[model samples]
Target: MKNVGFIGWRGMVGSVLMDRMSQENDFENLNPVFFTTSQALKSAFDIEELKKLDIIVTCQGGDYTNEVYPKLKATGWDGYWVDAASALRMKDDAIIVLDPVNQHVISEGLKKGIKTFVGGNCTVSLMLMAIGGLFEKDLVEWISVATYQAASGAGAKNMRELLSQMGLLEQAVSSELKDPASSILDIERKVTAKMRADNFPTDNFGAALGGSLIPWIDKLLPETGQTKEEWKGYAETNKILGLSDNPIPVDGLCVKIGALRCHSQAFTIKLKKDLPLEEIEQIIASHNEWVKVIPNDKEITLRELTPAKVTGTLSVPVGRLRKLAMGPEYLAAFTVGDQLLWGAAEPVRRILKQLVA
Candidate 1:
């Protein structure tokens, strides 16, 4: 059995990873030791305990990684480091792990003695999982995406704050909501007033996310005019696919929405050549086990291809597929996926399983 140390195991992404690992009996073959950052009444950080482990898996964010990782390696610990943080993701020595999309990349990295494996950004991982078939077939010339990211992607606190905002808005309109002939305009005004009030909870989101949306997510890269979140769409995707030299162009706008956990994307894709819709669907469905291609019907898409339906599940449902008004070579698609699952925890656990096996 491998000695595996788990850090940040109780956090949002960490907890999700722990739950999935337990549900899949991922701990049966390992000696798992949980660790903490704070030492108030707890044992101080023990380098010896970490040194004994054959692998360390952490979701403790970049700060912890920056503080502890160097010291651990300085002590001559050469064990595998599987991380959920973006800290070491772009390091020339580290490989991004998403086996279904890039098992060959992982295999090559292992053969080359690369020991550090990091997960890609949430939206990047989910996008690849959803549309990797087109990339696999060399059909995607470029992709422009507009993302509807959920509150959970921000953190657990943001999730709670969104619900709090929703509760307050509903409370403000509670009386009029029950009136059969209440003025819709009056209800809207009250809701807007509640959201704009100084007492509203904006500690996490810094805005009223429940009634509105944030057009941007993460830090802005002024040089490129892309948010750090959007930059990952191109940077991590190409790296994971080992296409650094001839990287497929993936540019996007990432927006934070009121949904709880699922991340949805609307894509305008330019294919290198024209292909029939049936063949395209076949290529996409055959790429992975989890992606479900919903028909382009309005009713089916409304039911199946949405955050409300796809949340808490591994399903990556893609719909709204059609040739755009531009040309037959241009395509449009919409995909919904659980950000906390494929977007965060699932790939981390799967990569850990791969190394353990």
Candidate 2:
């Protein structure tokens, strides 16, 4: 049995990880010990305790990982370390583990005696879920994606803040129900005014996310004007696919929407060559494990494929595939996945299995 330790088992993505592990009975051959950054919590990253474990799964974000990793490295405690932060991903020494896109990378890393595996940004992972198969088939050449991400991607605090804002708005709008003349437009304006008046919690989003869409996600880099989220799409994706030497451009726009869970993306792809729509459908549908392709008929409505509908699921559903009006070589599609699952925790678990098992 492998000795596995967890760093963020109580947090947002970590909770999802726990739930999925329990649901899937993933702990069969693994021994687990929970640690915390909290003083009151046990297994407080004591170097001796850490060295005994065969694997460490860290979802404590970049700050905690950054603070602790160097100490672990200095002590020469080199075991399998899976990080759910964006911190070590771009490093040549760390392999970004996305099984669908590059499971072989994990095998390759293990062969070279590498032990650090990093998780990509949630949007980048989800985008790969929908498109990785095509890229693997050498069918895609360029990608442009607009992500409609949910508040949960920010963290548990963000999800609660959104719900709290929604409740506050509900209470404010309901108070005006007695006045028959109060319009929804007026009520929305009033609630928004109150929300702004009170400065309802941004929850690290830096702006209110309830009843509104934030055009930005993550910090904008001075060099590229692309938010960290957008930059990861191009950088981590190429790295995972082993295309960093000669990268394929992945232009991304990250938008934070009011949705409480799951992330949805609209993708416009340019192919190396034109193929029949039937062939494209077959390429996506062939992988039955994680990706689901909806038929091109109008029978599949948007409501049935939305984030609200697919929350808490492991499957990444792809639909709305069609030839773009621009050209036969271009196509558009929509996809949705649970960010907490495939985007964050699930990749770590899968990577551990692929490399350690």
Candidate 3:
């Protein structure tokens, strides 16, 4: 059995990883040591403790990762490392793993003794799950996407804040009022104003999440004016797919909506050739094991394929596959996934499993 060190096991993504690993019995051969970053159990800063494990998988996002990872890599420590943070994803030595899309590349990297792997951003991972087949077959040419992301993507506290804010808004709007319609609108305006004010939850993205949408997710790049999250849809996807030289250009916008879990995306794809609709469907349908294609019908509305339906599940639901009016080779589709599973923790869990196997 391999001795493994785990950090942030109590956080949102870490908890999902723990649940899935438990249900699937993924930890049978790997002895786990829990190192809660702020708890007394063990400090992630304890270098002596870090050295005892055959592998280290960390879900802690900020300081814990920025502080501890480089120190470990600089030392004589030579063991497998799996990170859920965006710290080393674009590094030359680390792989961004999503098994169905790039398992072959991962296998080759492992054979060459590359020890570090980073999980890609939630939107990128989910997008790959939806369209990896077309890209794999070299049938895709260009793509554009707009994402409606969940508050849970920020963290557990962000999810709670969104729920609390939505409840508060509901309470504020429900009371008997002289002008009920105008009162409800006034309440929404007031709440959103307060949320945008100083000392709100914008840092966690909760302030602008409820009853409204934030046009941006991560920090905006000064030069390009694109938030880090939007850029990740292009940068990380290309890196993960190993399309460095001939990278598929992705025009993306990441927006934070009120959902508590999962993410929805609208995609416009330009294929290399004008294939039949049935052929296109077959290519996408047969691409990955987790992608489920829903038929275009009244029963399969956006309400049925939302975070409320797909949260806590691994499947990435894809539908609305119709040829775009623009051209024969142009098509559009929608996709949704449990971001906590496919986007964050599960990839790290799978990487560890692959290493052990």
Candidate 4:
């Protein structure tokens, strides 16, 4: 059995990874060791013990990686490093892991003795999972996306802040809500006032997310005028697909919405050639087992292609597919997936299993 070290197992993404591993009986075959950043704990920051492991997986955040990864490497620990943090993702020595979309790339990396595996950004991973077939068929010319990312993508604390904001907004209009004949405009006024009040909970998100959305996510890159999150759409996607030399163009706005744990995206795709709706749907659905192609019908799209429906599941539902008004060569789509699962945890867990095998 390979000795595996797990770090950040208690975090939001890490917890999801642990749960998935448990559900899949991933620990039964391995010598698993859990580690912590906290001091004075039994498994706290011991480099000697970590050196004994055959592999190390961490979701402990980029700061921890930045501080400790160099030191660990300095100790001549050449074990496989699988990380959920973005710190090492773009490194030439690392390969971004998203098995459903880029298992071939991972296999090539493994053959070449690449030892570092990192999960792609949440939206990037989910987007590729949804439309990877188009890319595989060499049908996509370019992609423009608008993301509706969930609170959980921000962190566990952001989820709590969103719920608190929701509760406070409701409390302000609770009496009005109870009355059957209450003025709708008056109730709206109270809710709006409450959301705008001095004490509104904006600590985690830095703005109102319950009743509104944040147009931007992550730090803005002055060079390209894209947020760090938006920039990853192109950067990570190409890296995962092993197309750094001849990259496909993917650009978009990344918005933060009030949803709990699912990230949703609306895409405008320029296909290299026009294909029928049935053909396009078939291409996508055949690409992966987890991606479900919901019919373009209004009712089915509303029923299945939504964050509410797809949250907490491995399902990646894509719908609202149609040729755009621009032309038959243009297509539009909407997709949703659990950010904590496929976005962050699932790929890391699968990579660990792959390394062990």
Candidate 5:
């Protein structure tokens, strides 16, 4: 068994990892050992304890993986870093594994003796679930996806503060108005208004994250003007699918909606072939084990595919499949999944499982 450790276990993704591991007990070959601080590793001079470890999954806060994961005196030479930090994410050879999509990359990393690395986050990983197969067949050309992202995926303190601040605002508004939760609702609106105006202190998650549609995420890419996260997502997707460099050239219009769980992506694809939709979908379904095509697409198709129900699922629930209106032969594929689960931790966990197994 691998001696797995985590640094950012107090964060949003960390919590999701715990939940998924508990739920998906059937996931073979993965085990959790300890959730410790880096300071502990620095001071604990026990060579035997550290030597037993084969992998250290570093999801350290900010970029601690840079200082701790790979270079730590405790676990460096013997074990590999399961790098979840963003510091090395954009590096060309940094092993990024988003399992369902990037399994090939995972294999490549293992082949090269890399034990730690980063993976695509919420949007890219979720997108990978829907589009991994389509791109593999070399039938897809371009993709456009609308994102309904959750606050939890943004970070941990952000999710907590959202509700904490909401409660405070509600009590203040209740005292002002004569009616009940209407005052809470009214006060919530005011608080949300203030947040959007750049009035809140946000170092962890975005400031206006809880109740508004934040226009974008991450730093903007200097070259293509895409958000840093988007660029990473596109790059990570390409890497994961084992597509030749720049395959399925993707463009994403990312929107941050006020959600507490999962990310929902509505995607439209321009395919090179005019094959039957079912046949194309079959290719998608057969290739990946994580995606689920909505069987009864007519009734409650949209409802079942929403972010709320699919909040913690590994299966990428896809619906609203149809031909696009943008001329002929274009197809649409909409999918939603727990952005934190299969999209993020599942890949991280899957990669580790492969190594120890």
Candidate 6:
């Protein structure tokens, strides 16, 4: 195997992946490259070592990715890359990856040399990668999803603040906390209307996570107040799948939760025929053959199997399928997985496994 290095492996997704890859006897082929500042890459650092790198995957988060990535691009390094950050997410050369079903495309990534491979946005990756193996009918005309996302997707520091705040809230110790009468959740509508709203912080993604679910995530996007961070599938799936012509239509909500790692998605897929319940169930079961199809008619005790349950694990787990009454041909499913691994870092591993390398 060629020498490989991770640029921002200290970042959240990067660190988690570094930790997981260390346990793997294979991907451990990589050595780490650290940068004191993303800006440091613009100037000379270590060319001999950097040139030796056959692969560089970015697990770096925050705005630093924007800074770190261009440096990689300018390095004129002709090698493969698995970009886990959004800096190159929309770039043409980088391919998003969802192996089992998308393995062919993963091979395509090496040709591109700097694959923008992705599992999709955190929620998108966690959601679709789990279901890709489940849809045997290939009859999906449309998919609509509403996500209960955790703050970790924004970056690790955000997740830390959330956990710290939650620890404080459960004990009534948060500095952001106020008496019940002064609490935002307890306020009346008249109070909400009275302020016309003051200029709120732009760090909506970094808000106190343990508090009630924040309806809005990040700033907002046009048409649907969804932020780019929340609705990344609009561009993500297209790049990785190399389906520039046939993009998957999508809509999303990134709601804040106290959870640390998992992203929970409530999804509905519109299939062509009104398929038989039993036949559909069987098809779903064998779709990935790798995924676990839950009982279609029962209540799942654990969406909690969430990011933590599936975290560090390679395959996605699915459960809680039901026939929604709204659309005769529609099927509803709830799935949970770690956006970082199966959704982000794992897809790279997924791609690597598929290749002869």
Q: What number of backbone clashes does candidate 1 have, counting pairs of residues 3 or more apart or in separate chains?
A: 0
Better of 2 and 3 by TM-score: 2
lDDT of 1 at 341: 94
In candidate 4, position 113 carries an lDDT of: 88
Give the TM-scores of the predictions, in the order they appear: 0.98, 0.93, 0.91, 0.98, 0.80, 0.78
**Distance from true location, Cα of 201 in model 4, Å:** 1.1
Better of 3 and 5 by lDDT: 3
Q: lDDT: which is higher, 1 or 3?
A: 1
C-alpha lDDT of all candidate models, in order: 0.92, 0.83, 0.83, 0.91, 0.66, 0.60
User: Which of the two candidates, 1 or 6, achieves a greater TM-score against the reference?
Assistant: 1
lDDT, residue 53, model 5: 69
Q: Tens digits of per-residue lDDT for model 2 on 1-357?
A: 888888888888888888878887878768888898777535646877888789988888888878778788888887888998888897777899888778777778779987789987788888888767788788888899998998888877888888887777677778786788878788878888867865576656777777778988878899989998898889988888888888989987989888888999999999978899888988887744778887756657465567876898888889889999999999999999988888899988778665445
**Candidate 4 or 3, higher lDDT:** 4
lDDT of 2: 0.83
Question: Candidate 6: where is the Cα deviation over 4 Å?
Answer: 27-48, 62-65, 68-75, 109-119, 134-137, 173-208, 223-225, 297-315, 352-356
Scored against the true structure, residue 231 in model 1 reaches a CA lDDT of 95
Sort every candidate by TM-score, greatest first. Answer: 4, 1, 2, 3, 5, 6
Candidate closer to the true structure by lDDT (higher is better), 4 or 6:
4
lDDT of 1 by residue, 1-357 (tens): 888899998899999999999899999979888888775412216777888889999999998887878888889998999999999999998999999999999999999999899998989899999888999999999999999999999899999999999999999999999999999999999999999999999989878899899998989899999999999989999999999999889998999988999999999999988889889999999999999999999899889999999999999998889899999999999999999999999999999998888
Cα lDDT of candidate 3 equals 0.83
Report clashes for each candidate as comma-separated counts.
0, 0, 0, 0, 4, 10
Residue pairs clashing, model 2: none
- Of 3 and 4, which scores higher on TM-score? 4
**Model 1, stretches more than 4 Å misplaced?**
40-44
Weakest ten-residue segment in model 3 by summed lDDT: 172-181
Worst 10 residues of 2 by lDDT: 296-305
Predicted candidate 6 versus true structure: per-residue lDDT over 46-134, tens digit per residue: 55555556665555553655654566658676656666655656666656676665666666556655444544566766665667644
- Of 1 and 5, the candidate ahead on lDDT is 1
TM-score, structure 4 vs. true: 0.98
